Ligand binder design. Structure first.
Ligand SMILES: OC[C@H]1O[C@H](Sc2cccc(Cl)c2)[C@H](O)[C@@H](n2cc(-c3cc(F)c(F)c(F)c3)nn2)[C@H]1O
Ligand SMILES: [Cl-]
Length: 138
């Protein structure tokens, strides 16, 4: 397994048609997972499954600019399961990141950070065993 937190460089930044695939297994009794597409210290796209936020399971998405979180976008479809293997696919489209989990579309996140070429690393953190993280062009 890859060591978490894991940094996946995205050479030259992201571009439409870039597909990121993450395979892992959620730990038993998991609390949180995060993907952070970063532009330097800024987080262009934070994707954050929370397994127990006031006894609800929710995915929180946001952007961090100059150390300030913005407006949260929340999704109650929650496809992660403690103890179970998952696949996350993040497809960069021209106007949003498009996320599917276990082959089912989950959400889209409109680009707030518009210098896509400067979003040149992906951090993967939280309560998973990380099997692989890679990218390809579709
Ligand atoms: O809005 C999104 C933000 O919400 C609050 S801050 C907040 C509170 C209220 C309103 C607003 Cl707008 C913001 C989180 O504390 C923020 N977070 C989570 C993690 C984190 C770190 C890990 F190492 C990890 F493994 C993991 F899964 C998550 N780091 N930072 C973030 O999720
Ligand atoms: Cl969290």
């Amino acid at each position: 397994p890859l060591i978490v937190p894991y940094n996946l460089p995205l050479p030259g930044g992201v571009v439409p048609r870039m597909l990121i695939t993450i395979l892992g297994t959620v730990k038993p009794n998991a609390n949180r997972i995060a993907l952070d597409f970063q532009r330097g210290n800024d987080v262009a796209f934070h994707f954050n499954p929370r397994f127990n936020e006031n006894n609800r399971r929710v995915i929180v998405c946001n952007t961090k600019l100059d150390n300030n979180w913005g407006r949260e976008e929340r999704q109650s479809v929650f496809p992660f399961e403690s103890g179970k293997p998952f696949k996350i696919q993040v497809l960069v489209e021209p106007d949003h990141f498009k996320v599917a989990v276990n082959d089912a579309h989950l959400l889209q996140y409109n680009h707030r950070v518009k210098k896509l070429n400067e979003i040149s690393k992906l951090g993967i953190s939280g309560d998973i065993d990380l099997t692989s993280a890679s990218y390809t062009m579709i």
